[PDB]
Design a protein around this nucleic acid. Structure first.
Ligand code: NA
Ligand code: NA
Ligand code: NA
Ligand code: NA
Length: 327
DNA sequence: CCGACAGCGCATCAGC
DNA sequence: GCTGATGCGA
DNA sequence: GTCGG
């Protein structure tokens, strides 16, 4: 990976613009265009000398090449400088860091004078359940989770799930499964032999047990197949308590389980390249199933999958260790 | 020139 | 009461 | 904003 020093000024500039498109202008596609440009530039192993040079990279077009030229010659971007100083826009952009507060809620809050966390604290009744929790753990939620804590967190989840019913199968995915040194949250996929695509408390019993042992502390949303909440490792003797963490738990039918583990294990880059290689071989792979694309294009029924490898086999690909799925 | 850029669970809104 | 749409997330 | 039919 190229050192941040190479084009960090440029990548930082593109990422800030991305946030403003997403959070203020509500232009999600522009948001992603910037992110895509920032990503391709972030992996470019050379210090960019001009916009034209950058334009050769996929995802970098005329407008961004133009912005790069301005930043190389001035060390900044007038539009970015201006929006940063804009009280309304910087406040809308900032409020979106609260989990539960999106571009719409952020805009509404700022419209009525609520611009800071302090304002949010004085207006609890104007926040829904999710937002109050995002506010309560604002700092904790932005902190990363060291792998050691992730292992401790896994120990608890795996233990409690098996305690509820030894037949449950639980897999912690995300970058953690790929061996990451830290994580932004914990993503748990859960299944049970009694639950197939064609077979109401399976998920509830697990969440309940996790709350019973005081691991899960709050709930953002909870249905029959998906749970999104907060957890916290138990504090040690006289030791500073651990920060609260975001944890999601999805209940997936057995026959769609491994397609789910693969997908949620990523990385996204790997998922694309795998979805690509998948198509050229006559297959389509999403998070639910792998299906054979017919002669005219009639995707027959989903193929049977009993493991990640099963999927790799259908596309003539040597099973890839989560460790080697960065792309 | 102009459409795609992912699809979907849950919470909550808009409206009958 | 309900259905469908919208906001939000990851 | 960028790509591509
Ligand atoms: Na380009
Ligand atoms: Na947010
Ligand atoms: Na956010
Ligand atoms: Na048992």
């Amino acid at each position: 990976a190229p050192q941040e020093t190479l084009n960090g000024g440029i990548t930082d500039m593109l990422t800030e613009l991305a946030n403003f498109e997403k959070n203020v202008s509500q232009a999600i596609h522009k948001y992603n265009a910037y992110r895509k440009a920032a990503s391709v530039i972030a992996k470019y192993p050379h210090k960019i000398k001009s916009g034209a040079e950058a334009k050769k990279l996929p995802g970098v077009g005329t407008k961004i090449a133009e912005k790069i030229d301005e930043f190389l010659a001035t060390g900044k971007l007038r539009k970015l400088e201006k929006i940063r100083q804009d009280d309304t826009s910087s406040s809308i952009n900032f409020l979106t860091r609260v989990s539960g507060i999106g571009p719409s809620a952020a805009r509404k809050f700022v419209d009525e004078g609520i611009k800071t966390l302090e304002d949010l604290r004085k207006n609890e009744d104007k926040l829904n359940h999710h937002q109050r929790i995002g506010l309560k753990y604002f700092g904790d939620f932005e902190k990363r989770i060291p792998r050691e804590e992730m292992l401790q967190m896994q120990d608890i989840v795996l233990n409690e799930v098996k305690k509820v019913d030894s037949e449950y199968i639980a897999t912690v995915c995300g970058s953690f499964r790929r061996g990451a040194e830290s994580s932004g949250d914990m993503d748990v996929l859960l299944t049970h032999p009694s639950f197939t695509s064609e077979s109401p408390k399976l998920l509830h019993q697990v969440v309940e047990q996790l709350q019973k042992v005081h691991f899960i502390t709050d709930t953002l949303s909870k249905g029959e197949t998906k749970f999104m909440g907060v957890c916290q490792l138990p504090s040690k003797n006289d030791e500073k308590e651990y920060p609260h963490r975001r944890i999601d738990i999805r209940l997936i039918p057995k026959d769609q389980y491994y397609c789910g583990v693969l997908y949620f294990t990523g990385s996204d880059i790997f998922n694309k390249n795998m979805r690509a290689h998948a198509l050229e071989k006559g297959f389509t792979i999403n998070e639910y199933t792998i299906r054979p694309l017919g002669v005219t294009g009639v995707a027959g029924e989903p193929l049977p999958v009993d493991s990640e490898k099963d999927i790799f086999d259908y596309i003539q690909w040597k099973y890839r260790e989560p460790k080697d799925r960065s792309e």
